[PDB]
Design a protein around this ligand. Structure first.
Ligand code: HEM
Ligand code: HEM
Ligand SMILES: ClCCCc1ccccc1
Lengths: 145, 145
């Protein structure tokens, strides 16, 4: 249940999401591309899904990848801004869930993003505490897939 | 090219865009739904393109329409944040252009959004000068369609 998952975002979890987002969300192009390049490097088996982006190994030099990466960061910004209202968080999560269901992405494969998130968070000095908070938000999307 | 359309956005135009977005972008849910409902009211021929959203006459109560509307406002947020770097603006514009090209939305049809934008701006007392500024931004997307 996406609603039961959203209910897991307690006061402490929301605070950790906001505090860390203030830092990682300040450089959407840089951190967005880092997130994607890490996903492709650590989980090569997912590259096939991103055929439209061309050669993803080019990273920042790939215009399609950069555009995709920046936009992905705005999806996260959207989620963060909706934390106050669970009904609005759910309707935006379901909107993005559809974007992935049409791409044949399962809850299990969507969860492969947790590794990259933990890694980039770690590079900014945000440990497991924060990685786990983000895993809870990702879990809301997983519940809708 | 799209780059030409973007690179032409002047300091004054960017100023008007940012000043007006400070206001209309502050209530993404309210203004996002207002934009969509106005599009459907004045251009009923476009309703068919949004069948995935269900009964759009439901307005705010329609969770799919609400989720779509909020997300659309973040696409605009994305554009506004990239104004000072044409290279970044171009790659995000091309990304969203693909989302509409796949739906067979022509440059002319995409331009139908100018009417609704002008009305929403006017509701907050932003006149023709501002509507013209936004038409120039919409024109950047049209250059990609
Ligand atoms: C924090 C997690 C993630 C977020 C917020 C997210 C967000 C997005 C957004 C905003 C889009 C563009 C939607 C569209 O325009 O159709 C997208 C596209 C896509 N995503 Fe994700 N995504 C995430 C994780 C993943 C993961 C882990 C996979 C794969 C295992 C995945 C696979 C895809 C694919 C295949 C596309 C289509 C790319 C294209 O052809 O343009 N996403 N995602
Ligand atoms: C300010 C201009 C506009 C912006 C920023 C915008 C933004 C968006 C975004 C972000 C999406 C979701 C893309 C996806 O997830 O696949 C979308 C979908 C769509 N847009 Fe637009 N759009 C604009 C104008 C228009 C206009 C004027 C039309 C029609 C004449 C249009 C038709 C569509 C359609 C048919 C969809 C698919 C809806 C669905 O089935 O989910 N858009 N738009
Ligand atoms: Cl503070 C939350 C950071 C989420 C994230 C976004 C992009 C890349 C890595 C992590």
């Amino acid at each position: 249940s996406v609603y039961d998952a959203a209910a897991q975002l307690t006061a402490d979890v929301k605070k950790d999401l906001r505090d860390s987002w203030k830092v990682i969300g300040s450089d959407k192009k840089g951190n967005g591309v880092a997130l994607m390049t890490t996903l492709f490097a650590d989980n090569q088996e997912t590259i096939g899904y991103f055929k439209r982006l061309g050669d993803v190994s080019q990273g920042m030099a790939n215009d399609k990848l950069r555009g995709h990466s920046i936009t992905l960061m705005y999806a996260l910004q959207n989620f963060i801004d909706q934390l106050d209202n669970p009904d609005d968080l759910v309707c935006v999560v379901e909107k993005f869930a559809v974007n992935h269901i049409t791409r044949k992405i399962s809850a299990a494969e969507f969860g492969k993003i947790n590794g990259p998130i933990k890694k980039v968070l770690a590079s900014k000095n945000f440990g497991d505490k924060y990685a786990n908070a983000w895993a809870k938000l990702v879990a809301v999307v997983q519940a809708a897939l």
